[PDB]
Amino acid sequence: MTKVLYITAHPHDDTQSFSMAVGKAFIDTYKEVNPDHEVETIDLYIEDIPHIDVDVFSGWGKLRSGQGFDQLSSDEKAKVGRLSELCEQFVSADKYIFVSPLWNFSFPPVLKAYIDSVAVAGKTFKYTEQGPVGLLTDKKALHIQARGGIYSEGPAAQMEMGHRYLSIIMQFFGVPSFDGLFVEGHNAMPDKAQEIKEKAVARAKDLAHTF
Amino acid sequence: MTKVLYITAHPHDDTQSFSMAVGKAFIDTYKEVNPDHEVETIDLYIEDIPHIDVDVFSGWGKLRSGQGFDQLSSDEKAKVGRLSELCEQFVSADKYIFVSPLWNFSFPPVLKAYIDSVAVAGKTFKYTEQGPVGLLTDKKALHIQARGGIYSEGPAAQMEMGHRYLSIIMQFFGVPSFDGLFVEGHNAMPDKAQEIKEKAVARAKDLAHTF
Ligand SMILES: Cc1cc2nc3c(=O)[nH]c(=O)nc-3n(C[C@H](O)[C@H](O)[C@H](O)COP(=O)(O)O)c2cc1C
Ligand SMILES: Cc1cc2nc3c(=O)[nH]c(=O)nc-3n(C[C@H](O)[C@H](O)[C@H](O)COP(=O)(O)O)c2cc1C
Numbered sequence: 520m521t522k523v524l525y526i527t528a529h530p531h532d533d534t535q536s537f538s539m540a541v542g543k544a545f546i547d548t549y550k551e552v553n554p555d556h557e558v559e560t561i562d563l564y565i566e567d568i569p570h571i572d573v574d575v576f577s578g579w580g581k582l583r584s585g586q587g588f589d590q591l592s593s594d595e596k597a598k599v600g601r602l603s604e605l606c607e608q609f610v611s612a613d614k615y616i617f618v619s620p621l622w623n624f625s626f627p628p629v630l631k632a633y634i635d636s637v638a639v640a641g642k643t644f645k646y647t648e649q650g651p652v653g654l655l656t657d658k659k660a661l662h663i664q665a666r667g668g669i670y671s672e673g674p675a676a677q678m679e680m681g682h683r684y685l686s687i688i689m690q691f692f693g694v695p696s697f698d699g700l701f702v703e704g705h706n707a708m709p710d711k712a713q714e715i716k717e718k719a720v721a722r723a724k725d726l727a728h729t730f
Numbered sequence: 731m732t733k734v735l736y737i738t739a740h741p742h743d744d745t746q747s748f749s750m751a752v753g754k755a756f757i758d759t760y761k762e763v764n765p766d767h768e769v770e771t772i773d774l775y776i777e778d779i780p781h782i783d784v785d786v787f788s789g790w791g792k793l794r795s796g797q798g799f800d801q802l803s804s805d806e807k808a809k810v811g812r813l814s815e816l817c818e819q820f821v822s823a824d825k826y827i828f829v830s831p832l833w834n835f836s837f838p839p840v841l842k843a844y845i846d847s848v849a850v851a852g853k854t855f856k857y858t859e860q861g862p863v864g865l866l867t868d869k870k871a872l873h874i875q876a877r878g879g880i881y882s883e884g885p886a887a888q889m890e891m892g893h894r895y896l897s898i899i900m901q902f903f904g905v906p907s908f909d910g911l912f913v914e915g916h917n918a919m920p921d922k923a924q925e926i927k928e929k930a931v932a933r934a935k936d937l938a939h940t941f
Contacts, residue, residue: 530782530783532785534784536784570741571833571838572743578878578917622846623845623846623899624898624902625842625895626842627782627842628843628846631834631836631839632839635833635834635839638834680891683891684835684895687891690889691834706789706790707861
């Protein structure tokens with residue numbers, strides 16, 4: 520019962536989103552190709568992602584569940600249960616789709632908050648003799664990212680940090696397959712915006728046949 | 731005067747914060763050395779950092795102005811005001827000190843929100859024929875970061891993304907000088923903790939004599 524998690528990190532504004540257009544093309548084609556697959560959406564601007572406070576983690580990837588947990592308010596226990604829920608939904612899926620805009624060489628803050636919620640020891644990684652090892656050894660992931668300028672080549676490619684960070688987390692979680700699909704340069708060459716968008720949508724449709 | 735911004739990204743009620751300990755030691759010595767200098771604090775867990783709404787920008791770094799501003803919602807007009815306040819405060823300063831914990835190879839989400847607030851065209855960068863170029867050519871920066879693991883050498887150094895990102899942003903804003911001051915390993919060596927903290931505190935008082 521292949522399950523796919525469509526994770527969007529985009530506010531619900533008037534301005535047209537290139538990343539959400541490519542994402543929509545990808546995910547609509549994917550379901551037409553794979554009608555039996557379950558696709559679950561997590562819209563990070565609609566869902567509540569808890570803030571990390573002193574109380575929710577006892578250390579790196581260690582959800583509070585000891586004597587300090589029992590000393591928590593029902594509010595703080597509810598926060599720990601929500602992080603548990605976010606993480607469980609993440610580990611339960613076979614495939615991950617991230618959709619994001621490039622903001623100041625990275626992604627919206629709430630995608631970091633989401634990563635912080637699902638990075639849990641015994642769930643996405645474990646502590647070994649040789650250090651942290653990922654558990655998600657049979658998953659695959661895709662990032663659909665829109666960028667105003669060109670980041671796939673030239674001096675700018677070294678400044679990209681959003682896809683680069685997601686690549687580091689997927690490595691850390693031991694995800695063996697991480698695809699990038701980029702719609703870029705439409706703010707640098709607005710005369711070519713519709714051609715750039717159409718080309719990325721076609722690429723998205725192609726990837727939806729093999730993902 | 732010389733104006734120093736002390737920017738902290740740490741949840742409150744942590745009665746064992748390594749980054750804030752070293753931060754304390756660096757800034758307390760700095761004020762004693764330089765009692766004439768104005769030090770302004772921005773605690774990102776006290777102040778409100780607006781959520782980006784793409785509708786308040788006309789392009790990367792460009793806050794809506796004139797008719798574009800006049801057609802906004804009341805909430806949107808207030809956000810532009812707050813972003814312009816945060817950006818003005820950042821530009822006003824001669825020196826920047828960032829204090830953060832390493833969370834999942836990066837920093838708390840609110841520090842991304844703060845960068846998104848101060849990356850403004852005409853203030854921290856400008857466009858030219860070649861695209862964006864930094865405006866902050868006169869200024870100096872330091873990152874005080876706590877890591878529960880070693881990231882200054884080995885294969886792990888290549889997974890570190892929080893200091894690496896701040897380094898890209900300082901470079902983008904044209905800040906010619908960016909130092910890191912790290913407290914690392916106290917989690918890999920719980921008994922060495924009190925020792926590692928004192929070494930870093932030492933190094934902090936040291937740098938505060940010259941910065
Ligand atoms: C807050 C903000 C930050 C941005 N930062 C960048 C940037 O770092 N580099 C760039 O080339 N374009 C930047 N842009 C332009 C966007 O990457 C571009 O508009 C992209 O299409 C955003 O994705 P979306 O269309 O899905 O919203 C920025 C835009 C905004 C609103
Ligand atoms: C949410 C969270 C994420 C963390 N992620 C990492 C990590 O990626 N690598 C690491 O070596 N330690 C990690 N740690 C351990 C912290 O970096 C370590 O506790 C550090 O001292 C935090 O700074 P502070 O002491 O000022 O709170 C993490 C801890 C927390 C609570």
